[PDB]
Design a protein around this ligand. Structure first.
Ligand SMILES: NC(=O)c1ccc[n+]([C@@H]2O[C@H](COP(=O)([O-])OP(=O)(O)OC[C@H]3O[C@@H](n4cnc5c(N)ncnc54)[C@H](OP(=O)(O)O)[C@@H]3O)[C@@H](O)[C@H]2O)c1
Length: 325
């Protein structure tokens, strides 16, 4: 088929990446012919949205090539109650300097708020023109099915996108979530395509006790969460397996682990570009992004390497982190 689409992740805009690095990145991304951006109310205390709103992209003014997604979250007391959802979205619109977003997600479940309450509110906001499509992230397949079923019966807008954790060594979503989304007509966007950077091969397990190199896995408030998600001895072993396969198969022409990992996504995963499925790229620099953008344009990997990626998943599958929260 056509390959999956490519979406630009903006989680680092306002933390490691300033307005100028951010602009450069978006420019680089658009030059490759891509068009969707992914942000959230949460990112950098609103700076990711603020940065994007100032880039003069005319977001949400249909007459408009660039598509924006944002998300409302229940954290730090906010809940996904109707007033909370509305406030988050209205704040996001202000920061993005736009009258409506193309895609609005529920960022993660609020297990203390009945989902019908949240959905009804989403439907109202859509009726007001504040977003085009609804999405879900970090809900379990069964929770997705409940939501779609409830929307159908109540005349609410159905979610059409699911944003989920997926990479060569993180495949829990395959068994149940994907079949569920296919049944109910949702496309799937993959986050953590490089396992937060673990799939670059840049780390060694014992970095956790020693170097503690500043980044995704050290120094910030989600770091421990990231380490619990991915920083496992079998995951390192699994990566080494793949690196060895890349050397044996390609020799001096071997692609970098980063570029192998991304190529897995675009060529060897269960993402289907004909369904509108996509990979959300991540970066904390322009230079990382350019590398990643180049990888997305490379071709399939050799069979021996694809096999090694399967072996690598088989090693970590028993301790795979939950795509759902
Ligand atoms: N829905 C959700 O709950 C959710 C969750 C996560 C992400 N997302 C979205 O998806 C986007 C991407 O996910 P992600 O950031 O987790 O993707 P990722 O590609 O798995 O992680 C990206 C991180 O890996 C490192 N990296 C990327 N390219 C590199 C390269 N070429 N060389 C060396 N290191 C490299 C950088 O980390 P360091 O430089 O910091 O080491 C970068 O911040 C986000 O920006 C956000 O929009 C959504």
């Amino acid at each position: 088929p056509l390959r999956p689409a490519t979406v630009l992740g903006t989680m680092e805009m306002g933390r490691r990446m300033d307005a100028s690095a951010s602009a450069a990145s978006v420019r680089a991304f658009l030059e490759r012919g891509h068009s969707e951006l992914d942000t959230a109310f949460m990112y950098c205390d609103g700076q990711s949205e603020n940065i994007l709103g100032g880039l003069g992209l005319g977001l949400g003014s249909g007459d408009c090539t660039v598509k924006i997604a944002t998300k409302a979250n229940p954290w730090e007391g906010k809940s996904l109650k109707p007033d909370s959802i509305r406030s988050q979205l209205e704040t996001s619109l202000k920061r993005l300097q736009c009258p409506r977003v193309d895609l609005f997600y529920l960022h993660a479940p609020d297990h203390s708020t009945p989902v019908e309450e949240t959905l009804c509110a989403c439907h109202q906001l859509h009726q007001e023109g504040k977003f085009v499509e609804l999405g879900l992230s970090n809900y379990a397949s069964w929770e997705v099915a409940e939501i779609c079923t409830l929307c159908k019966s109540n005349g609410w807008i159905l979610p059409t996108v699911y944003q989920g954790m997926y990479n060569a060594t993180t495949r829990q979503v395959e068994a149940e979530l994907l079949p569920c989304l296919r049944h109910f007509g949702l496309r799937f966007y993959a986050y953590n395509p490089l396992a937060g950077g673990l799939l670059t091969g840049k780390y060694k397990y014992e970095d956790k006790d020693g170097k503690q190199p500043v980044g995704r896995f050290f120094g910030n408030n989600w770091a421990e969460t990231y380490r619990n998600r991915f920083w496992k001895e079998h995951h390192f072993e699994a990566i080494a397996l793949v690196e060895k396969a890349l050397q044996t198969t390609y020799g001096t022409n071997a692609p970098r682990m980063t570029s192998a990992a991304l190529r897995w996504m675009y060529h060897h995963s269960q993402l289907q570009g004909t369904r509108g499925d996509a990979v959300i790229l991540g970066m904390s620099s322009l230079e990382q992004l350019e590398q990643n953008l180049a990888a997305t344009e490379e071709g399939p990997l050799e069979p021996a390497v694809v096999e090694a990626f399967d072996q690598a998943w088989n090693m970590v599958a028993h301790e795979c982190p939950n795509y759902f929260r």
